[PDB]
Design an enzyme around this catalytic site. Structure first.
Site, PDB file in Angstrom:
ATOM      1  N   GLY A   4     -12.213  -2.814  28.957  1.00 43.36           N
ATOM      2  CA  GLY A   4     -12.877  -3.391  29.647  1.00 43.36           C
ATOM      3  C   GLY A   4     -14.107  -3.042  29.910  1.00 43.36           C
ATOM      4  O   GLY A   4     -14.551  -2.438  28.953  1.00 43.36           O
ATOM      5  N   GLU A   5     -14.289  -2.805  31.139  1.00 39.05           N
ATOM      6  CA  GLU A   5     -16.210  -2.918  31.661  1.00 39.05           C
ATOM      7  C   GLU A   5     -15.762  -1.429  32.817  1.00 39.05           C
ATOM      8  O   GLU A   5     -15.004  -1.421  33.891  1.00 39.05           O
ATOM      9  CB  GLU A   5     -16.508  -3.653  32.303  1.00 39.05           C
ATOM     10  CG  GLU A   5     -16.902  -4.861  31.135  1.00 39.05           C
ATOM     11  CD  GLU A   5     -17.796  -6.148  31.658  1.00 39.05           C
ATOM     12  OE1 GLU A   5     -17.613  -5.765  32.581  1.00 39.05           O
ATOM     13  OE2 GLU A   5     -17.546  -7.347  31.385  1.00 39.05           O
ATOM     14  N   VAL A   6     -17.277  -0.471  33.056  1.00 35.56           N
ATOM     15  CA  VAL A   6     -17.422   0.397  34.660  1.00 35.56           C
ATOM     16  C   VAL A   6     -18.420  -0.089  34.664  1.00 35.56           C
ATOM     17  O   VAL A   6     -19.586  -0.624  34.021  1.00 35.56           O
ATOM     18  CB  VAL A   6     -17.299   1.679  33.636  1.00 35.56           C
ATOM     19  CG1 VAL A   6     -17.645   2.238  34.948  1.00 35.56           C
ATOM     20  CG2 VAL A   6     -15.933   2.251  33.666  1.00 35.56           C
ATOM     21  N   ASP A  56      -6.369  12.357  25.638  1.00 37.37           N
ATOM     22  CA  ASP A  56      -7.986  11.787  25.475  1.00 37.37           C
ATOM     23  C   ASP A  56      -8.928  12.651  25.784  1.00 37.37           C
ATOM     24  O   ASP A  56     -10.084  12.059  25.795  1.00 37.37           O
ATOM     25  CB  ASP A  56      -7.534  10.258  25.252  1.00 37.37           C
ATOM     26  CG  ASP A  56      -8.766   9.697  24.227  1.00 37.37           C
ATOM     27  OD1 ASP A  56      -8.679  10.294  23.307  1.00 37.37           O
ATOM     28  OD2 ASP A  56      -8.984   8.174  25.557  1.00 37.37           O
ATOM     29  N   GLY A  88     -16.462  -2.261  26.336  1.00 37.59           N
ATOM     30  CA  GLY A  88     -15.671  -1.790  25.779  1.00 37.59           C
ATOM     31  C   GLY A  88     -14.487  -2.358  25.627  1.00 37.59           C
ATOM     32  O   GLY A  88     -14.279  -3.388  26.171  1.00 37.59           O
ATOM     33  N   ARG A  89     -13.378  -2.216  24.516  1.00 39.30           N
ATOM     34  CA  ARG A  89     -12.002  -2.600  24.287  1.00 39.30           C
ATOM     35  C   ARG A  89     -10.881  -2.132  25.730  1.00 39.30           C
ATOM     36  O   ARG A  89     -10.590  -3.140  26.344  1.00 39.30           O
ATOM     37  CB  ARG A  89     -11.523  -1.828  23.663  1.00 39.30           C
TER      38      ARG A  89
HETATM   39  C1  LIG Z   1     -15.534   7.853  30.932  1.00 38.44           C
HETATM   40  O1  LIG Z   1     -14.221   6.924  32.391  1.00 38.44           O
HETATM   41  C2  LIG Z   1     -14.833   6.594  32.986  1.00 38.44           C
HETATM   42  C3  LIG Z   1     -16.508   6.495  33.630  1.00 38.44           C
HETATM   43  C4  LIG Z   1     -16.564   5.904  35.052  1.00 38.44           C
HETATM   44  C5  LIG Z   1     -17.830   6.948  35.094  1.00 38.44           C
HETATM   45  C6  LIG Z   1     -18.789   7.327  36.630  1.00 38.44           C
HETATM   46  N1  LIG Z   1     -19.453   8.060  36.862  1.00 38.44           N
HETATM   47  C7  LIG Z   1     -20.224   7.732  36.199  1.00 38.44           C
HETATM   48  C8  LIG Z   1     -20.249   6.446  34.848  1.00 38.44           C
HETATM   49  C9  LIG Z   1     -21.682   6.211  34.148  1.00 38.44           C
HETATM   50  C10 LIG Z   1     -22.744   5.798  35.180  1.00 38.44           C
HETATM   51  C11 LIG Z   1     -24.035   6.034  34.117  1.00 38.44           C
HETATM   52  C12 LIG Z   1     -24.177   5.972  33.381  1.00 38.44           C
HETATM   53  C13 LIG Z   1     -25.298   5.961  32.305  1.00 38.44           C
HETATM   54  C14 LIG Z   1     -26.094   4.598  32.212  1.00 38.44           C
HETATM   55  C15 LIG Z   1     -27.242   4.466  32.484  1.00 38.44           C
HETATM   56  N2  LIG Z   1     -28.499   5.359  31.954  1.00 38.44           N
HETATM   57  C16 LIG Z   1     -29.141   5.280  30.991  1.00 38.44           C
HETATM   58  C17 LIG Z   1     -27.383   6.706  32.084  1.00 38.44           C
HETATM   59  C18 LIG Z   1     -26.451   6.798  33.202  1.00 38.44           C
HETATM   60  C19 LIG Z   1     -23.094   6.301  32.249  1.00 38.44           C
HETATM   61  C20 LIG Z   1     -21.590   6.805  32.543  1.00 38.44           C
HETATM   62  C21 LIG Z   1     -19.050   6.352  34.396  1.00 38.44           C
HETATM   63  C22 LIG Z   1     -19.018   5.621  33.518  1.00 38.44           C
HETATM   64  C23 LIG Z   1     -15.349   6.062  35.594  1.00 38.44           C
HETATM   65  C24 LIG Z   1     -14.221   5.508  35.440  1.00 38.44           C
HETATM   66  O2  LIG Z   1     -13.323   4.601  36.365  1.00 38.44           O
HETATM   67  C25 LIG Z   1     -13.991   4.481  37.586  1.00 38.44           C
HETATM   68  C26 LIG Z   1     -14.068   5.624  33.550  1.00 38.44           C
HETATM   69  O3  LIG Z   1     -12.068   5.654  33.688  1.00 38.44           O
HETATM   70  C27 LIG Z   1     -11.613   6.509  34.299  1.00 38.44           C
END
Ligand SMILES: COc1cc(-c2cncc(-c3ccc(C4CCN(C)CC4)cc3)c2C)cc(OC)c1OC
Ligand SMILES: COc1cc(-c2cncc(-c3ccc(C4CCN(C)CC4)cc3)c2C)cc(OC)c1OC
Ligand SMILES: COc1cc(-c2cncc(-c3ccc(C4CCN(C)CC4)cc3)c2C)cc(OC)c1OC
Ligand SMILES: COc1cc(-c2cncc(-c3ccc(C4CCN(C)CC4)cc3)c2C)cc(OC)c1OC
Lengths: 291, 282
Positions: free
Chosen positions: B19-21, B132, B16-17
């Site tokens: 960046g990436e996780v 947010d 997304g805008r």
């Molecule tokens: C909101 O923000 C932040 C979130 C995270 C974060 C931490 N744990 C897990 C996740 C995640 C993992 C896996 C999926 C899906 C993908 C595949 N499948 C279909 C089901 C699972 C979704 C989400 C995330 C995105 C880290 C961040 O920073 C290091 C964030 O920024 C503060």
């Protein structure tokens, strides 16, 4: 590859510790900050996020890390490693010829002018310039280190970022307006002028170690003769502000054209009136013309 | 003494805008790595400055591991946290319905995290507002509790997602010199999150489809103006379905979310009062 090996401590103080380490077979410096100095770690990280900051006379950045598990935080700054150590170290074991003395002080002036001058990179005042914050390179040039107290200003967008670091400069190098606390805290030019004062003191430390007519002075820090060891803020205020002391010019310099010119330069760094002092660019230009 | 900084990036779990996780590993251990876009670098600096001020440690706050700045041929900014394989509450509500216990556990865990952000402790921590709060910024844990994520806009004592902006943010009357104003904005957003979750709780064999707040009155990617007209001008609020009034939990939750959506910010419940209310439900 990000793996770092800590080999030896090259510095310990209230600021934290610096370690010689190895990363992809190359020496690196690893500063681990004391928790007391977390604001310097953050400020230094902000400054190194400026991409045009990179300069042969500015300590080169590799990485910055804040790591934490539970209630324990580590604050790392990783830079290039300078095995010849600080200018402060170097001046105590070597005398300089004319070429080496001018290469050292021109390189520091070039680094300082690079910090001070806005590029259309913000203009940057260092606020803690001293011979311990200057590293000696094998090519005979120096680089300026430690941007923990740095102030940023852009005329282009009318921004002044003075930071929120309660840390203050090294007491021995503090300008009169810093020691008497009259300095104009919302004036960017005030911070550049404090750097010029400190630079004058570094010029004096270096010039004492340049041989002329078979004579050289011992290494001494600024004001070594007029303040107690480990001088307080009040001790420095007494000599600089009440007694109006300035480092003495050894009479032997006046037989040498180079040291005569440097004596004139460092005196133009030391006016009580901050606006009277030379600019970093004028100092760079004068040192470019001296031989 | 070796310092293993090697983080393997294994799979991209968000883009997304911002960046990436990435799901990553550090010494066999799953980590989440947020790699910031140049556009979003301010969010890395704000969250790093916050964690350099107070090392937050709370079961309902996403666990901090590291802020990393690396030099390249430009600067890379990584934020490293604990990894929650179940993903965001937003994603989770799409393919799951809730019973009374799981619904209350989700919303009480979010209230606990938010009250912890909001509370000043002397000794401690400054009061923190999130700015947010939304279901995409909440992660689901295997124990059925959530944790609040993304302190990129947080303020200690970009703008918020437009869909979740409180009336005073949309009509620009937020009292910007009162820190409580930022708390009240979070509570409004918490109210909308509550509504998103309560829809997915089953009662008498009925559940609502997952929908984002105001799904029926604004477009996808609503404009600031679209949101101001709904929330400020028409003073619309999310629908409470009739079927909630047959269930004592949803009846109590409807009352709760209403007390988060007052136009007057000072009339809204505090995170601490929401926690107390939630402990008395069932
Ligand atoms: C909101 O923000 C932040 C979130 C995270 C974060 C931490 N744990 C897990 C996740 C995640 C993992 C896996 C999926 C899906 C993908 C595949 N499948 C279909 C089901 C699972 C979704 C989400 C995330 C995105 C880290 C961040 O920073 C290091 C964030 O920024 C503060
Ligand atoms: C950033 O994150 C992680 C770090 C570590 C980790 C690795 N080496 C050493 C340490 C450590 C040891 C000792 C002290 C203290 C002990 C008490 N004394 C009074 C002062 C010193 C602190 C830190 C840690 C915490 C492991 C992790 O996970 C297994 C981490 O999480 C991914
Ligand atoms: C000032 O500031 C920073 C400096 C450095 C740094 C970089 N190269 C080499 C060094 C060094 C090596 C060796 C010695 C010797 C000389 C004297 N002898 C008696 C023992 C010690 C001194 C110095 C340092 C200290 C790194 C930093 O950060 C990673 C600094 O912080 C910004
Ligand atoms: C620089 O960067 C990263 C480093 C690390 C990391 C790896 N091993 C060990 C450590 C460690 C922690 C804590 C201490 C203590 C030892 C006791 N002493 C009294 C105080 C200090 C030493 C070492 C760290 C911090 C992980 C990272 O990622 C998860 C890093 O970021 C990429």
């Amino acid at each position: 590859a990000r793996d770092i090996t800590l080999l030896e401590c090259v510095g310990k103080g209230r600021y934290g510790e610096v370690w010689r380490g190895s990363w992809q077979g190359e020496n690196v410096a690893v500063k681990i900050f004391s928790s007391r100095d977390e604001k310097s770690w953050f400020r230094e990280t902000e400054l190194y996020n400026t991409v045009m900051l990179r300069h042969e006379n500015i300590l080169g950045f590799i990485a910055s890390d804040m790591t934490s598990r539970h209630s324990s935080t580590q604050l790392w700054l990783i830079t290039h490693y300078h095995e010849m150590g600080s200018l402060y170290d170097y001046l105590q074991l070597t005398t300089l010829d004319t070429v080496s003395c001018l290469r050292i002080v021109l390189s520091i002036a070039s680094g300082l002018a690079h910090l001070h001058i806005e590029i259309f990179k913000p203009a940057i005042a260092h606020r803690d310039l001293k011979s311990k914050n200057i590293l000696v390179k094998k090519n005979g040039q120096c680089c300026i280190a430690d941007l923990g107290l740095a102030v940023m200003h852009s005329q282009s967008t009318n921004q002044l970022d003075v930071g929120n670091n309660p840390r203050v400069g090294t007491k021995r190098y503090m300008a009169p307006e810093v020691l008497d606390e009259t300095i104009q805290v919302d004036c960017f030019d005030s911070y550049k002028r404090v750097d010029i004062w400190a630079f004058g003191l570094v010029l004096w430390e270096v010039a004492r170690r340049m041989v002329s007519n078979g004579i050289v002075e011992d290494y001494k820090p600024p004001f070594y003769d007029v303040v107690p060891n480990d001088p307080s803020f009040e001790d420095m205020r007494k000599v600089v502000c009440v007694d109006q002391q300035r480092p003495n010019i050894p009479n032997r310099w006046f037989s040498d054209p180079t040291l005569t010119s440097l004596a004139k330069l460092m005196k133009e760094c030391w006016y009580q009136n901050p606006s009277a002092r030379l600019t970093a660019l004028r100092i760079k230009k004068t040192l470019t013309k001296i031989d």
